[PDB]
Structures are given as C-alpha cells and as structure tokens.
C-alpha cells in the first residue's frame, strides 16, 4: 500500500462484466458516477491503483477520509472522480507461516497529499535526540509489516483494493464500452437511431457503393437517406414510410 503501483489504461474498450469471476465477493461502492450506466460510457483518462490493505482499513479508501492508510499510505482527493473495487483475498494472500511480505508506512512527518507515494526508508525521529541510524527507543522504523489473522474476522484479513480514477470527458474518448447491436429489421416502417441519428422510415437494401471512409448518405433535400450500419458494414436505404393526402 505504501509503494502502491500505478497503471495506465487507454486505447481500449472496458468490459466490466468480467469483474465477477476474477474478483468475487467484490464491493463496487464508489463515487462520482453511476455504477450501472458505466457500460455505455466513455472515459478519456483512466488510472489504476492496486494494493493490499487490512479488512478494517478498507473503509479508509474514500474522499475526505482520514486514517492510517489515508494520511501515511494513500490519500484520496476530496474531488475524486472514479470508482474503487475491493474484494477479499484470504485464499490467496494468507500463509500458514504468515503474510509478512506486505508493509505499510506507519510513522511519517506529515499527512500525504492526495495521489502520492512515499518509499522513504529513513529512520523516523519521534523524540529530541537524533536517531543517527539507530532504531532504539523514540526511533521507530516508519514501515510496519501486516500480520494478517484469518482466524479473526474479515477486519484482520488481506483485502485487495483496486482504485480506478477517470475524468469523463466523453469527447476525446479513448476508453468506452460495447454499444451492442439490434436484430436488423427490414422492409417496414421503422423508428431507427444510428449513433444518435434518430429517425423514422422504411429500411431497405441499398444498391449504393459509397466509399469506405464515406459513412452517411444525403439527398437533394439535405436529409439523410442512405446509412451504413455500425454493427455490420452494409448499405441501407432510408425511405420515409408511404404517405399522402386523403380526399
């Protein structure tokens, strides 16, 4: 947690349905965005931060929250945008001898700024006489080692926490979600909406051969009459449904 890894995610589509088998028993409580509508959403910036903290310390990963993890290990900004994911890892991060390999910063001169990492190993001076490299009384190592106790409750068990930070510009987007597709229906009056282009008409097979870069099709009236399907590269004719005046 003190030396938390930072990862960049971009130029890809984010699939959130996979995060049930890889991370069972996960908590998706988060801030800044509705969790449900993340599938049809576009992210321009994505940061990933992952580490392991104790069960009682999972609540400390929240904006405006103070504590041992927050002040000395990982601080979240007040205006944090993005979501965090945490799931138990007792089957993976618990050893019969002891999970002594995970360390956290315990003594620190001042509270960490948001999104900051501290890897210093200098001996902390908590008194008046300088330590001078001695770790005796009033001179404690700033880093302590987790001693996970699976025998106790989940608060003394290794919790794997992955912190995701976004910005949600949805204009120069580089991370988005699969927009899915619909069973094309042809030769009938249809309410269609292609990439935000909502309209009503009869969708028929089109003989036009407009170029690969060329997407839409316009007419003399400056209205869209030909369209190419985003799901399948095919040419469609948009014709207004049969109409006329009655006398």
């Amino acid at each position: 947690v003190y030396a938390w890894n930072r990862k960049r995610i971009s130029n890809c589509v984010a699939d959130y349905s996979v995060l049930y088998n890889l991370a069972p028993f996960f908590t998706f409580k988060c801030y800044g965005v509705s969790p449900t509508k993340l599938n049809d959403l576009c992210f321009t910036n994505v940061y990933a931060d992952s580490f392991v903290i104790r069960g009682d310390e999972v609540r400390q990963i929240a904006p405006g929250q103070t504590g041992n993890i927050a002040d000395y290990n990982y601080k979240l900004p007040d205006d944090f945008t993005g979501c965090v994911i945490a799931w138990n890892s007792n089957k993976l991060d618990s050893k019969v001898s002891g999970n002594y390999n995970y360390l956290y910063r315990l003594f620190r001169k001042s509270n960490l700024k948001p999104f900051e990492r501290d890897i210093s190993t200098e001996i902390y001076q908590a008194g008046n006489k300088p330590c001078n490299g001695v770790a005796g009384f009033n001179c404690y190592f700033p880093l302590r080692s987790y001693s996970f106790r699976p025998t106790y409750g989940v608060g003394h068990q290794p919790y794997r926490v992955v912190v995701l930070s976004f910005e949600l510009l949805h204009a120069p987007a580089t991370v988005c979600g699969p927009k899915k597709s619909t069973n094309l229906v042809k030769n009938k009056c249809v309410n269609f909406n292609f990439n935000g282009l909502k309209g009503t008409g009869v969708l028929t097979e089109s003989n036009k051969k407009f170029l690969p870069f060329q997407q839409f099709g316009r007419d003399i009236a400056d209205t869209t009459d030909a369209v190419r399907d985003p799901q399948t590269l095919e040419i469609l004719d948009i014709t207004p449904c049969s109409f006329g005046g009655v006398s």
Partner: antibody
Amino acid sequence: QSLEESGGDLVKPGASLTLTCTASGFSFSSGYDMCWVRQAPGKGLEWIACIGTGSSGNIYYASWAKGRFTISKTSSTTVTLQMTSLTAADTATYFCARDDADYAGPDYFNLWGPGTLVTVSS
Amino acid sequence: DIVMTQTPASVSEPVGGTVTIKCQASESISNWLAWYQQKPGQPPKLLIYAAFTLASGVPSRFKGSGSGTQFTLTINGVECADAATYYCQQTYSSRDVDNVFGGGTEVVVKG
C-alpha cells in the same frame, strides 16, 4: 534439510540427461514451493523452469527455456528435470532452489542444495 | 516482461570503506525483491528479502533501501570476508521472464 542433486555427467551435444533433486528430512508439501536454477561457470545465476509441489502443479518456464526442458515430480521426495537437444552453451552448475511462498512462481529462496555440475564435450 | 539490471559490475573499497549496490527494474515491483550473495564454490544465501527485512544469521550491516523500481543495498562495513557476488531477484511476476535474478556484482575488499 538438504536438496542434493543427481544425474550430472559429461554429455554429448544434442542429447538428453536426467537430473534428480532429492529432498532429505522433509517431503514436498503443497503449501511451500520448489524451483530449479542453474549457474554457468563464468557468469551469474539464471532461471530456466520449475513446478510447484502442490496438489495442482503450477509449472512455470522461462522465455529462453520454453520447450527444451521438462520438469516433473515422480515422488514426494524426488523431482527430476529433463532437457533434450543439449548444446555447447548448456554446461553450467545446476541447483535445486527451495522457495518459501506458493505465489505461483519463484519467490524468496531460503534454502538451496549443494548442486551438481553438468558439462558438454565431444 | 520485467527486465532487471544490476550495477556496478565491479566495486572495490577499503576494509573500512563503504560500498553500495543498486538494483533497478524495468517497471515497478513494489516491495517484492530479494538479495543473494554467493561465495566461490558455494550456492548463494538469502540476505535481504522484501528489500528491507534482514535474514537470519546475517550481520546487521546488510540492509536495503528504495522501493518500486530502484532498490539499493548499502554496505556500512566490510571485514575482508564479505568479498563475494551480490544478486537481486524480482520475485514479482514470473509468468514469462528470461531470468528473475539480476546481474552479477562481485565485491573486492583490499585489506
């Protein structure tokens, strides 16, 4: 505990050899991992391939040791390594690394065996 | 995936002198790193596991500093018997790695 090696002798190029790591005083438990390393006579250590001593062997290989070598467990206190198409550069001193944590890969090695020397000549 | 280098290749300090060996990784390995030292004709032994915790039976002079990508081992004192080669292991991600162990760095103590 000891992890004395076996099966080390002069071998012709393009041949096969069977190196055996035998444990003494303990058995290959599931919770703790074992690995295999070798040391060239002139340069530093290297990792080639090894398998876990658990119920489901999480066998792991190196990039330059992708398919030439083969490691398997034959008994609770006997593990063997098989390599084929041996070349001139394969001569080294082979050690039987003993890991301390079963994180699906070589973690901190607390114990090593005395090791064996395998050389190639014609 | 992770490529690790150990520098300097050769070091030489007086018996009362201090020498430092730094171990650098291509990307961040957090806290996962170990230090190994072998004498000629002898397999290496673990010295500094987790890059900070000292081993058993080893003098306190052996230590560890740095985290993430750069790890440094500082030798406070030699006694003409610690002249050997030091290696660092990534012990972080070994899915497809040519060698977890780092480069060789022998120490020469001029007594």
